Amino acid sequence: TSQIVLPPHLERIRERLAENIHELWVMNKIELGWQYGPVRDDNKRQHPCLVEFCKLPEQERNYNLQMSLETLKTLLALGCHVGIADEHAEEKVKKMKLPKNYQLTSGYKPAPMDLSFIKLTPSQEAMVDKLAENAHNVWARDRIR
């Protein structure tokens, strides 16, 4: 799976979406007990990806935004409507939808909402295998070469 590159019309969304999506996603790598440290290794109980979006360096700055860009480019490549009509409900339109659920421990625990009071679309339930296969697709077009 490799469809198109994303246009820049969303770029007003993307940076605030980044300062959201890190503050949703980065909590997920402390349930082992990893913390922030200087150098890359796991034998001594750390994972330095636990740093805020702009705080990271540039190659790690985009390494948070790539999961978003996965969930954006194939969506816009899907042909369906994914134009930003319902503008995302944090930092632009004050409805307070994005951060709802969190629990703080000995570690960086920002606020992902595990949203479950709405149905999920017929698409994104079907795109679970698409987006999880795209991992091996990205890895396979590297590996077979």
Side-chain angles (χ1 to χ4, degrees), residues 9-17 20 82-98:
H9 180 272
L10 282 292
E11 183 42 73
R12 66 204 192 297
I13 296 97
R14 297 298 303 290
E15 200 53 22
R16 312 314 310 171
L17 190 139
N20 294 329
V82 301
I84 187 67
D86 180 305
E87 188 63 17
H88 83 275
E90 168 64 78
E91 303 153 288
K92 305 160 167 41
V93 293
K94 183 33 59 197
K95 183 159 58 138
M96 190 48 193
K97 219 163 72 178
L98 267 69

Side-chain angles (χ1 to χ4, degrees), residues 9-64:
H9 180 272
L10 282 292
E11 183 42 73
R12 66 204 192 297
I13 296 97
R14 297 298 303 290
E15 200 53 22
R16 312 314 310 171
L17 190 139
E19 208 76 53
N20 294 329
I21 195 69
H22 209 87
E23 280 74 348
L24 321 175
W25 180 47
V26 75
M27 59 87 84
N28 67 337
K29 290 172 190 193
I30 305 97
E31 312 308 343
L32 174 149
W34 286 314
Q35 298 293 109
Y36 172 42
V39 74
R40 286 304 162 167
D41 41 18
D42 267 14
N43 65 87
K44 52 167 172 58
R45 178 74 174 272
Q46 65 181 51
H47 182 64
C49 205
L50 307 173
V51 178
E52 287 290 0
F53 181 84
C54 317
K55 282 197 193 79
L56 280 162
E58 182 42 68
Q59 82 302 354
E60 291 287 325
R61 186 216 70 93
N62 223 31
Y63 194 24
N64 161 266

Side-chain angles (χ1 to χ4, degrees), residues 5 14 35 46 49 65 69 77-78 83 91 104 110 112 115 122 138 145:
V5 71
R14 297 298 303 290
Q35 298 293 109
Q46 65 181 51
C49 205
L65 188 63
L69 180 54
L78 213 64
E91 303 153 288
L104 185 55
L115 183 62
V138 172
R145 297 173 201 160

